[PDB]
Every structure is written in structure tokens, then in C-alpha cells.
Amino acid sequence: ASRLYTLVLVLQPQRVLLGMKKRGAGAGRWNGFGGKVQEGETIEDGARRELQEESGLTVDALHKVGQIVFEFVGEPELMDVHVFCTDSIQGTPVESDEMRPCWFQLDQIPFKDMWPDDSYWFPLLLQKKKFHGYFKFQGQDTILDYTLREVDTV
Numbered sequence: 508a509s510r511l512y513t514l515v516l517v518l519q520p521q522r523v524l525l526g527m528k529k530r531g532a533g534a535g536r537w538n539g540f541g542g543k544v545q546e547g548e549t550i551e552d553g554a555r556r557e558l559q560e561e562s563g564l565t566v567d568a569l570h571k572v573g574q575i576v577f578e579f580v581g582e583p584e585l586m587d588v589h590v591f592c593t594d595s596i597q598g599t600p601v602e603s604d605e606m607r608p609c610w611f612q613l614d615q616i617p618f619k620d621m622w623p624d625d626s627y628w629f630p631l632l633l634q635k636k637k638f639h640g641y642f643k644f645q646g647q648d649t650i651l652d653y654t655l656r657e658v659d660t661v
């Protein structure tokens with residue numbers, strides 16, 4: 508019993524774009540851009556749509572980088588997050604009522620103000636590795652258990 512989500516990292520040679528979410532799940536943290544996949548929509552089309560809705564940016568080709576399943580204790584549905592990256596975007600990042608994008612130099616990624624799982628898999632993304640992960644959370648701050656492995660095929 509899992510629900511499909513996407514997550515997109517705009518990762519350029521010296522910087523990455525993150526968004527500070529203003530409300531709802533993950534508010535107050537920097538993260539990639541993403542959300543629920545819709546009926547009749549491919550996962551990649553959903554990732555492209557969410558990048559535009561949340562950041563104002565248009566992406567063409569998205570590259571599969573990982574899959575992470577999240578379990579939140581006490582919540583029945585698992586979150587099956589399909590992670591993508593791109594280095595080629597059009598438009599400039601847009602701040603909205605929901606999201607404040609900002610570019611970060613790679614040595615200044617704000618891990619203390621990101622979801623805690625990012626500290627594990629973001630370094631793989633930065634070295635162009637692909638991965639499958641599973642994180643069991645208690646609330647939004649505590650990783651009870653996890654697994655993470657690099658893969659050749661996402």
C-alpha cells in the first residue's frame with residue numbers, strides 16, 4: 508500500500524536549487540520540488556508538472572536518480588518517492604505563497620534545515636550515483652531505521 512510521489516533536484520555543476528516550503532507537509536525545510544502523481548499521468552510527467560508548479564521552471568528531459576520509500580509510524584500509506592535530476596532548465600525560479608526557491612553552492616547545502624534522510628542520499632546524488640532507499644520515520648524529525656543502496660537501474 509504505497510502512493511506515488513516525485514521529487515526533482517535541479518543540479519548544476521556548482522549549485523543546486525532547493526525550495527523552502529511555506530505550508531503543509533515539510534514546511535520550514537528546504538527540499539526538492541515534487542508532489543503526488545495524478546490519475547492518467549506518468550511519473551515523469553508528474554515530476555515535470557510539479558517542478559513548474561512549485562518553482563516556475565520548465566524542464567525537458569528528467570533523469571531518474573533514485574527511489575525512496577518512506578514509512579511514517581502510525582500512518583497506513585507508504586510514500587513511494589521517485590527522485591529525478593536535471594541540469595537544463597528554462598525560466599527563472601519563482602517565489603510563491605507556497606514555496607521560496609534558492610540556489611545553494613554544493614558545499615553550503617543546508618542539511619540541518621532539510622529532511623534528515625537527505626543527509627544520506629544527497630551525497631550520492633552529488634556524485635551522480637543512483638539509489639534505492641527506505642526510511643522509517645517517527646514524526647518528521649526521527650529516523651528509526653533505514654536502508655540505502657546504490658543501484659545501476661532505478
Ligand SMILES: Nc1nccc(-c2ccccc2)n1
Pocket residue numbers: 512513514538539541542577586588622623624625
Ligand atoms: N527529502 C524528503 N524526505 C522525506 C520526504 C520527502 C518527500 C518528498 C516528496 C514528497 C513527499 C515527501 N522528501
